[PDB]
From Swiss-Prot, chain A:
Described purpose of this protein according to its UniProt entry: DNA-dependent RNA polymerase catalyzes the transcription of DNA into RNA using the four ribonucleoside triphosphates as substrates. Largest and catalytic component of RNA polymerase II which synthesizes mRNA precursors and many functional non-coding RNAs. Forms the polymerase active center together with the second largest subunit. Pol II is the central component of the basal RNA polymerase II transcription machinery. During a transcription cycle, Pol II, general transcription factors and the Mediator complex assemble as the preinitiation complex (PIC) at the promoter.
Protein name: DNA-directed RNA polymerase II subunit RPB1
Domain comment as written in the entry: The C-terminal domain (CTD) serves as a platform for assembly of factors that regulate transcription initiation, elongation, termination and mRNA processing.
Subunit architecture: Component of the RNA polymerase II (Pol II) complex consisting of 12 subunits. Interacts with DEF1; the interaction is direct and serves to bridge RPB1 to the Elongin complex in a DNA-damaged dependent manner. Interacts with the Elongin subunit ELA1. Interacts with the Elongin subunit ELC1. Interacts with ASK10. Interacts with ESS1. Interacts with RTT103. Interacts with SHE2.
Places the protein is found: Nucleus
Parts forming coiled coils: none
Family listed: Belongs to the RNA polymerase beta' chain family.
Shown residues within the full chain: 1343 to 1454 of 1733
Covalent cross-link Glycyl lysine isopeptide (Lys-Gly) (interchain with G-Cter in ubiquitin), where: 8
From Swiss-Prot, chain B:
Subunit structure of this chain's protein: Component of the RNA polymerase I (Pol I), RNA polymerase II (Pol II) and RNA polymerase III (Pol III) complexes. Component of the RNA polymerase I (Pol I) complex consisting of 14 subunits: RPA135, RPA190, RPC40, RPA14, RPB5, RPO26, RPA43, RPB8, RPA12, RPB10, RPC19, RPC10, RPA49 and RPA34. The complex is composed of a horseshoe-shaped core containing ten subunits (RPA135, RPA190, RPB5, RPO26, RPB8, RPB10, RPC10, RPA12, RPC19 and RPC40) where RPA135 and RPA190 form the DNA-binding cleft.
Biological process annotations from GO: nucleolar large rRNA transcription by RNA polymerase I; ribosome biogenesis; RNA-templated transcription; termination of RNA polymerase I transcription; termination of RNA polymerase III transcription; transcription by RNA polymerase I; transcription by RNA polymerase II; transcription by RNA polymerase III
Major location category of this protein: cytoplasm
Keywords: Cytoplasm, DNA-directed RNA polymerase, Nucleus, Phosphoprotein, Ribosome biogenesis, Transcription
Further remark: Present with 6090 molecules/cell in log phase SD medium.
A single GO cellular-component term on record: cytoplasm
Spans annotated as Leucine-zipper: 40-61
Similarity comment: Belongs to the archaeal Rpo6/eukaryotic RPB6 RNA polymerase subunit family.
Protein name: DNA-directed RNA polymerases I, II, and III subunit RPABC2
Swiss-Prot record, chain D:
Compartments where located: Nucleus; Cytoplasm; Cytoplasm, P-body
Domain of life: Eukaryota
Organism classification: Eukaryota, Fungi, Dikarya, Ascomycota, Saccharomycotina
UniProt xrefs under Gene3D superfamilies: Nucleic acid-binding proteins, RNA polymerase Rpb7-like, N-terminal domain
Keyword terms of this UniProt record: Cytoplasm, DNA-directed RNA polymerase, Nucleus, Transcription
Gene name of the encoded protein: RPB7
Family the UniProt entry places it in: Belongs to the eukaryotic RPB7/RPC8 RNA polymerase subunit family.
Listed GO biological process terms: DNA-templated transcription initiation; nuclear-transcribed mRNA catabolic process; nuclear-transcribed mRNA catabolic process, deadenylation-dependent decay; positive regulation of nuclear-transcribed mRNA poly(A) tail shortening; positive regulation of translational initiation; RNA-templated transcription; transcription by RNA polymerase II; transcription elongation by RNA polymerase II
Other comments on record: Present with 6420 molecules/cell in log phase SD medium.
Protein name: DNA-directed RNA polymerase II subunit RPB7
A GO term, aspect molecular function: single-stranded DNA binding
Coiled-coil segments: none
Any one GO CC term of the record: nucleus
Subunit structure of this chain's protein: Component of the RNA polymerase II (Pol II) complex consisting of 12 subunits. RPB4 and RPB7 form a subcomplex that protrudes from the 10-subunit Pol II core complex. The RPB4-RPB7 subcomplex probably associates with TFG1. Interacts with NRD1 and PAT1.
Curated annotation (Swiss-Prot), chain G:
Coiled-coil regions, chain positions: none
Zinc finger (C4-type) stretch: 36-58
Subunit structure: Component of the RNA polymerase II (Pol II) complex consisting of 12 subunits.
Organism (species): Saccharomyces cerevisiae (strain ATCC 204508 / S288c) (Baker's yeast)
Residues involved in Zn(2+) binding: 36, 39, 55, 58
Function noted in UniProt: DNA-dependent RNA polymerase catalyzes the transcription of DNA into RNA using the four ribonucleoside triphosphates as substrates. Second largest component of RNA polymerases II which synthesizes mRNA precursors and many functional non-coding RNAs. Proposed to contribute to the polymerase catalytic activity and forms the polymerase active center together with the largest subunit. Pol II is the central component of the basal RNA polymerase II transcription machinery.
Gene name of the record: RPB2
Descriptive protein name: DNA-directed RNA polymerase II subunit RPB2
Cysteines joined through disulfide linkages: none
Other facts: The binding of ribonucleoside triphosphate to the RNA polymerase II transcribing complex probably involves a two-step mechanism. The initial binding seems to occur at the entry (E) site and involves a magnesium ion coordinated by three conserved aspartate residues of the two largest RNA Pol II subunits.
Family stated for the protein in its record: Belongs to the RNA polymerase beta chain family.
Length: 112, 84, 107, 171, 177, 270, 97, 551
């Protein structure tokens, strides 16, 4: 019902300039500050302080700081989020980068 | 470790992303002097020839569709429906 | 289930873990006046069995983690008498679907 | 001594090769790199046995370039020396410092101080020998070497040995 | 670079490798514990001179078949046939394979996979190491005094009466070069 | 903030909404599973009217002379009357519409039918009437058996989570419930022959065009749904030039920053 | 010009992951470094002319990797190192999920 | 991409195991001995000694000498050194957990005050979260500020457990910038909890104990939170930016290293020789100061420690902090190659998917097409035009990677191209590019157009695309990015094309509309009142590009 009050409270911000946004865009963010177990802020003490790898969080608000507790508490990076691959100059698992492509010697041999 | 070709909850349609990367990897390879599995019917642009390759569905590429849990499923360019 | 008028002694409520496995639930009369659950805003919450919970993770390929977690203190998670681990299948409605299956793990 | 370790190889063929009989070039590239080679770890990778049955793999293409990575899992004939085990080998070079032995594709070396006292050097012989009671070690002599020391000289592992201890020496 | 069948998780802990000794302490790949890629807990297999030779001679015979298929569309006497196949199905620059074949068709204790067979049926059966089989089968020993010495790995591993019997059998079974 | 939070989050192959670990947000993206733009505001005719207007428009009763589709509507119209199993069929048809009626009257008790729904069913029939030159002069060929069941088969081939189990089959039914209620409103037996007068040929085109237009509507696994959610919130938030609350812009920073010290707290009791 | 902050955001919503690799690297910092297997630090004394890939301390010349990261990333790593923080880059993961 | 091949296998970065530098490892991992602040030159004699620069780190002045690695300047990554600190130093930021652990561990035996005998400590030891395990242990052990020699068992209270020895009280630890302050009581004695005294206890701490805290005996131990070995950063982190030739150019980081090097040999003088004790704590506190300074200057410790210029000194913290501070302006954001910013003007003739590109911009922006028999012949014409004629080539990259800079080559006309070569040809008519109007807050704000090489110095665009980009022809400035990968230009053309985003996923409506002249003209024409006569009609009908030619 929290997800609810938060959503209704945001849709009546979409109407605060009359403009439309499909349910899905807000209902995702509304579900982000809910899927934790309660209510979480869209700040460095909500999303940037949780579970995500040492580099996904240091990329916003607090940096040197976040990276310092990555060091002392011998932390680890997945290399699974955006921000992770971003730093490394790699093809992140985003859209075209998600799936990997190979060649079947078999399907390759058929054509000739 | 993976998953077999029977047991696929993965959309049997190619994604607009898979289209762009197959048609791109073929654009790269075909410009990289790579073998052309289609008759070069007046076609000379690498990226273009690669498009008349997905047409004749004679691209040797297979897509590794990884599940976010860990394991994966395989699909060839022939295996994917192109209703894109 | 103890239904007190004002409160219970903290001297007394320390005698709650005293008789295991049996769990002792405590609710003040105050929130019971109105049915907290029968609200417009809160959808159905369902106690999912050991097998129902396992099946969720086995098919939807999830982990004890990955799940959208639930509060223990959730007026629901006490109205259902929920304990840690239990899965709550929630049937919320959608502006663009009609129904959608959400699952929570109790903390 | 000579054993068979199942090993892997990362051959990354370029797009111009992704055509019908590619399996022939993936196997060839393997026989180039792995065959003839000597590592520090697995010793002399002498022969990539049974050419026919070789893992091919559906290899991943890069975003960068069209090239695809292939790991080839093979069964090969290997040989690595060890400190203490005795092996037969035909002698090759000789002088004042000692004589070198040819144990397979590997060179063991016996120093003058690794040979008995009675087994002394003779520069006054063509080609140089090693005088004793009956024992006269020339060049194409047959010897039993106790591999006292193993040294990995990168693309080839060479060694040190002794014929001093009992039973060892001339074959 | 060619990677191994054996792999672990030695993260940060770099201090590796304990002195190689004939005392059956070998490489991380070279132990009774290693895997055959097919997912089998295969014990390392070491071969004595000849049990060896007649494997490269085996798969190089197998290789001649392939190259000519895809092209369609007596000791001193064996020494020649040895370098013949090497100038064929072998790279030609394969110096490390050539040296080995000549020395193996010189020093080999058994000329035939008929005779090599009975030898290995008798050796890996004794209850000894695949490494001792490979040392008894190539180094023509006589006394257990001599034997347990050149291969210390035995010492108490076998009956001094037995070690002899085993070796004595191999002396008739020995090729007649 | 919105985009650094909703970064990692996308659409996956389980047809789930996950991220940088695999933590699920939605078990089907958008509680439905469609590609944001493919959706045009469609109308649910089943909620609307008096339970009597609905009856005239939808109920077919091939037992009563005053409720039988006249042989001016279907070629079978004169013989399809007074049939046992044929009216027994239609019962499921009108009863499923009354089922759909209160269902939609439970999800939205404000009546409004003008909801964002994928696959414009209007446009497909629009095209059918002029791409088949259906003459609403002579009766439609179709049998009552053709229509009721033709939908009952189309209803299956409209998929989101391709799964073969329990839940994957279950949250799937849940996902395409609303679309199916709209499907049932347009492709209802009476509305099909009385209003539309479309052939088996045209009807099959209406069913065919809906099917694939829908499987195109499936969200593409990979689509950065998260970044996109934020890039559709953060973008028009800028344009905000602002019985008394906080006017949009400060109101947003109260909810996004999660404020308990509300600039305008207000309790509304019915 | 700048393919900066949000200039990245929008690209991510698209799907062109390999345009983002091309942008942040090829048309920017792009660097060929030599990290050790064990301590995944830019330790390696890479004598490219004569293949002596010797590593200081970790006794390596054996398992060594060439990694492709933008110079700004290798630089930022060298930067937190001089603040006693090890960004040990492993070519091979050991996490699973 | 790095320059010059290496036989080293190439790969992904799959994990980044963050940790601490063992003051044990720092030493080993060093090629340089770093002993004196005489940087470069051996008394102005243009070279370098065993000092701050290349005692074996990496030379400046377009030269090799980088301890066997040499590899010029580019392909030469920096080589780290070391410096042994004269007394342990509290690592500026790890000073937090230093106070914290100290309130948990017995400052005598190296054992947590509380253990498996206290139920909430047990509840804590169980928490599987690495710093929340600490979170509770800290809150728990800070309380009992006396370790128990003996304490009653979990079964009966007359039954005690001698668990761990020592019954000595814990201090009330409070900050004082660079040294902690204790406290035990008759009358309160506050102890100067010194770096040396503190580190000792940390060494003793039971593996299982720092394990039950946020620590690790492989990557990051608490005994390394205190530095004895400072790693000396190589010169491509603290450059030598020389003016002409006979003038210095060291970065402010090289200064604070020199200012530590001073402060190290100062504490060495007082120590190794006549000991002044309560004067040694000055050279100690200045070394302790400058080691904490060189990392962070912009802190809670009032002196920003200004260098003699009034400059706080470029803190390694300030070098990584937000927007243009590495992570947010050099890593997440960047300045890229193959880019173009130009003024915008309207257009009633271009298609929605076409972009205005002046001749000069098309002649400045290059694309590398691979010499394949399809192109080759035409690329060879580009090759004999260079960068003066619109279709030409800037450089021609050999099979080997040698840049044949067409512009000044002697064989510039000859150029006998082979396959596998790359000709760097100008970007031309109907080619793909990422056109963009800042800020890029929208997926729709960064879209792909089709080059149409126009004269006149402005970036022109179709007037219906005036709305999805946030456009107004008041001289708006837009970007342009040239893809190089035939894979990358496949990525623009398939997800970034303008015709695709006509319909807005953001709100389920189309986000491109016909504006102004077209918005008023169409209505002024679609009236019952308005008509047209044959001569003007025929011009109108012909004007439709794909008209059937049917009147
Ligand atoms: Mg403006
Ligand atoms: Zn190392
Ligand atoms: Zn160097
Ligand atoms: Zn103590």
């Amino acid at each position: 019902a929290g997800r609810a009050a938060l959503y209704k409270e945001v849709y009546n911000v979409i109407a605060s300039d009359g403009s439309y946004v499909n349910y899905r865009h807000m209902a995702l963010l509304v579900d982000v500050m809910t899927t934790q177990g309660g209510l979480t802020s869209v700040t460095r003490h909500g999303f940037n302080r949780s579970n995500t790898g040492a580099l996904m969080r240091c990329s916003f608000e607090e940096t040197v700081e976040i990276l310092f507790e990555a060091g002392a508490s011998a932390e680890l990076d997945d290399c699974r989020g955006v921000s992770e691959n971003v730093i490394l100059g790699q093809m992140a698992p985003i859209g075209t980068g998600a799936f990997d492509v190979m060649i079947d010697e078999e399907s390759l041999v058929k054509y000739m | 470790k993976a998953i077999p070709k029977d047991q696929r909850a993965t959309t049997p349609y190619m994604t607009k992303y898979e289209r762009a990367r197959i048609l791109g990897t073929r654009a790269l390879q075909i410009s990289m002097n790579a073998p052309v599995f289609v008759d070069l019917e007046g076609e000379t642009d690498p990226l273009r020839i690669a498009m008349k390759e997905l047409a004749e569905k004679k691209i040797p590429l297979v897509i590794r569709r990884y599940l976010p849990d860990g394991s994966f499923e395989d699909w060839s360019v022939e295996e994917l429906i192109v209703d894109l | 289930i103890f239904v007190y008028q004002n409160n219970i002694t903290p001297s007394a409520m320390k005698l709650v873990p005293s008789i295991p496995p049996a769990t002792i639930e405590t609710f003040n009369e105050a929130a019971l006046v109105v049915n907290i659950t029968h609200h417009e805003l809160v959808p159905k919450h369902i106690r999912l069995s050991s097998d129902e919970k396992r099946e969720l993770l086995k098919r939807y390929r999830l982990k004890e983690s990955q799940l959208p977690r639930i509060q223990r203190a959730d007026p629901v998670a006490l109205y259902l008498g929920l304990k840690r681990g239990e899965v709550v299948k929630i049937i919320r409605k959608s502006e663009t679907s009609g129904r959608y299956a959400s699952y929570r793990i109790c903390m | 001594m000579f054993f068979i370790k199942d090993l892997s190889l990362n051959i990354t063929l370029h797009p111009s090769f992704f055509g019908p009989r590619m399996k022939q070039y993936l196997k060839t590239k393997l026989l180039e790199e792995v065959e003839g080679s000597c590592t520090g770890k697995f010793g002399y990778i002498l022969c990539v046995l049974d050419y026919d049955n070789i893992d091919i793999q559906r290899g991943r293409i890069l975003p960068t370039d069209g090239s695809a990575e292939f790991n080839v899992k093979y069964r090969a004939v290997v040989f690595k020396p060890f400190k203490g085990e005795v092996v037969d080998g035909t002698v090759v070079s000789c002088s004042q410092h000692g004589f070198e032995v040819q144990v397979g594709p590997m060179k063991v070396f016996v120093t003058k101080h690794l040979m008995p006292q009675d087994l002394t050097f003779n520069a006054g012989s063509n080609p140089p020998s090693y005088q004793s009671s009956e024992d006269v070690i020339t060049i194409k002599s047959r010897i039993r070497v106790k591999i006292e020391g193993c040294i990995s000289q990168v693309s080839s592992i060479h060694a040190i040995g002794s014929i001093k201890e009992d039973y060892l020496g001339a074959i | 670079s060619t990677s191994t069948f054996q792999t672990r998780r030695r993260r940060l802990k770099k201090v590796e490798e304990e002195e190689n000794a004939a005392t059956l302490q070998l490489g991380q790949e070279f132990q009774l514990k290693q895997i055959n890629h097919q997912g089998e807990e295969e014990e390392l297999i070491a071969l004595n001179l000849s049990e060896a030779r007649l494997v490269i001679k085996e798969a190089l015979v197998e290789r001649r078949r392939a190259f000519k298929r895809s092209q369609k569309k007596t000791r001193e006497k064996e020494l020649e046939s040895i370098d013949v196949l090497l100038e064929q199905t072998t790279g030609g620059n394969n110096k490390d394979l050539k040296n080995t074949m000549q020395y193996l068709t010189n020093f080999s204790r058994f000329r035939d996979q008929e005779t090599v067979g009975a030898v290995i049926q008798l050796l890996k059966s004794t209850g000894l190491h695949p490494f001792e089989v490979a040392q008894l089968g190539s180094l023509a020993c006589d006394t257990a005094d001599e034997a347990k010495t050149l291969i210390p790995s035995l010492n108490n591993k076998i009956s001094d009466d037995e070690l002899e019997r085993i070796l004595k059998e191999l002396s008739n079974l020995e090729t007649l070069y | 903030r919105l985009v650094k939070a909703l970064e990692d989050i996308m659409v996956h192959y389980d047809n789930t909404t996950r991220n940088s670990l695999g933590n699920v947000i939605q078990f089907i993206y958008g509680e439905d599973g469609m590609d944001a733009a493919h959706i045009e505001k469609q109308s649910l005719d089943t909620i609307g009217g008096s339970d009597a207007a609905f009856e005239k428009r939808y109920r077919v009763d091939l037992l009563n002379t005053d409720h039988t589709l006249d042989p001016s509507l279907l070629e079978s119209g004169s013989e399809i009357l007074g049939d046992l199993k044929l009216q027994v069929l239609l019962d499921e048809e009108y009863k499923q519409l009354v089922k759909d009626r209160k269902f939609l009257r439970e999800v939205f008790v404000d009546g409004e039918a003008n909801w964002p729904l994928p696959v414009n069913i209007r446009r497909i029939i629009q095209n059918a009437q002029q791409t088949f030159h259906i003459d609403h002069t002579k009766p439609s060929d179709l049998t009552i058996k053709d229509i009721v069941l033709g939908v009952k088969d189309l209803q299956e081939n409209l998929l989101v989570l391709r799964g073969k189990n329990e839940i994957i089959q279950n949250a799937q039914r849940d996902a395409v419930t609303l679309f199916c209620c709209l499907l049932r409103s347009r492709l209802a037996t009476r509305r099909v022959l009385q209003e539309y007068r479309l052939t088996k040929q045209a009807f099959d085109w209406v069913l065919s065009n809906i099917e694939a237009q829908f499987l195109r509507s499936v969200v593409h696994p990979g689509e950065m749904v998260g970044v996109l959610a934020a890039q559709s919130i953060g973008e028009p938030a800028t344009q905000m030039t602002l019985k008394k609350v906080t006017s949009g812009v400060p109101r947003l920073k109260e909810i996004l920053n999660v404020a308990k010290n509300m600039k305008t707290p207000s309790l509304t009791v019915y | 010009l700048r393919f900066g902050e949000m200039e990245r955001d929008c690209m991510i919503a698209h799907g062109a992951a390999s345009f983002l690799k091309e942008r942040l690297m090829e048309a920017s910092d792009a660097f060929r470094v030599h990290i050790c297997g064990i301590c995944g630090l830019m330790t390696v004394i890479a004598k490219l002319n004569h293949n002596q890939f010797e590593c200081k301390g970790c006794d390596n010349k054996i398992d060594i990797y060439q990694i492709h990261i933008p110079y700004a990333a290798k630089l930022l790593f060298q930067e937190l190192m001089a603040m006693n923080i090890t960004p040990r880059l492993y070519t091979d993961r050991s996490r699973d999920f | 991409v790095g320059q010059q091949y290496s036989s080293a296998p190439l790969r992904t970065v799959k994990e980044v195991q963050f940790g601490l530098f063992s003051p044990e490892e720092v030493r080993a991992i060093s090629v340089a001995k770093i002993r004196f602040p005489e940087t470069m030159d051996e008394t102005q004699t243009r070279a370098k000694i065993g000092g701050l620069n290349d005692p074996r780190l990496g030379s400046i002045d377009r030269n090799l000498k980088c301890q066997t690695c040499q590899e010029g300047m580019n392909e030469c990554p920096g080589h780290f050194g070391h410096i042994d600190l004269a007394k342990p130093v509290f690592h500026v930021g790890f000073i937090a957990k230093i106070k914290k652990v100290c309130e948990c561990v017995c400052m005598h035996c190296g054992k947590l005050l509380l253990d498996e005998h206290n139920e909430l400590m047990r509840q804590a030891l169980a928490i599987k979260d690495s710093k929340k395990r600490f979170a509770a242990i800290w809150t728990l052990c800070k309380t009992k500020m006396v370790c128990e020699t003996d304490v009653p068992s979990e079964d009966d209270p007359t039954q005690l457990v001698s668990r761990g020895g020592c019954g000595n009280t814990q201090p009330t630890i409070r900050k004082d910038g660079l040294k902690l302050v204790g406290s035990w009581k008759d009358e309160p004695e506050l102890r100067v909890l010194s770096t040396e005294e503190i580190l000792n206890i940390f060494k003793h701490i039971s593996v299982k104990d720092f394990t039950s805290l946020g620590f690790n005996e492989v990557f990051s131990r608490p005994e390394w939170m205190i530095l004895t070995c400072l790693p000396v950063p190589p010169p491509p982190v603290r450059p030598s930016i020389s003016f002409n030739e006979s003038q210095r150019g060291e970065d402010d980081l090289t200064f604070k290293l020199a200012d530590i090097l001073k402060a190290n040999i100062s504490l060495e003088t007082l120590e190794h020789n006549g000991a002044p004790h309560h004067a040694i704590e000055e050279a100690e506190s200045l070394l302790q100061f400058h080691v904490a300074t060189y990392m962070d200057n912009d802190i809670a410790g009032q002196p920003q420690a200004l260098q003699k210029s009034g400059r706080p000194v470029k803190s390694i913290r300030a070098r990584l902090k937000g927007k243009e501070g590495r992570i947010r302006g050099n890593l997440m954001g960047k300045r890229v190659d193959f880019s173009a910013r130009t003024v915008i003007s309207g257009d009633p003739n271009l298609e929605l998917d076409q972009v205005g590109v002046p001749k000069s911009i098309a002649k400045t922006l290059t694309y590398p097409e691979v010499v394949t028999p399809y192109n080759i012949d035409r690329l060879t014409q580009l090759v004999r035009n260079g960068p003066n004629e619109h279709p030409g080539a800037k450089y021609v990259i050999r099979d080997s990677g040698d840049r044949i800079d067409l512009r000044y080559s002697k064989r510039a006309g000859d150029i006998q191209l082979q396959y596998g070569w790359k000709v760097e040809r100008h970007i031309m008519d109907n080619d793909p590019v990422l056109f963009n109007r800042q800020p890029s807050l929208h997926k729709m704000s960064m879209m792909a157009h089709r080059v149409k090489v126009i004269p006149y110095s402005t970036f022109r665009l179709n007037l219906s695309v005036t709305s999805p980009y946030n456009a107004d022809f008041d001289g708006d400035e837009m970007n342009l990015h040239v893809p190089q990968s035939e894979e990358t230009r496949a990525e623009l053309s398939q997800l970034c094309a303008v015709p695709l985003q006509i319909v807005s996923p953001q709100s389920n409506k189309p986000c491109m509309g016909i504006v102004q002249d077209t918005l008023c003209g169409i209505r002024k024409l679609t009236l019952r009142d308005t008509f047209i006569e044959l001569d003007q009609v025929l011009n109108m009908l012909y004007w439709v590009p794909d008209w059937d030619g049917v009147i």
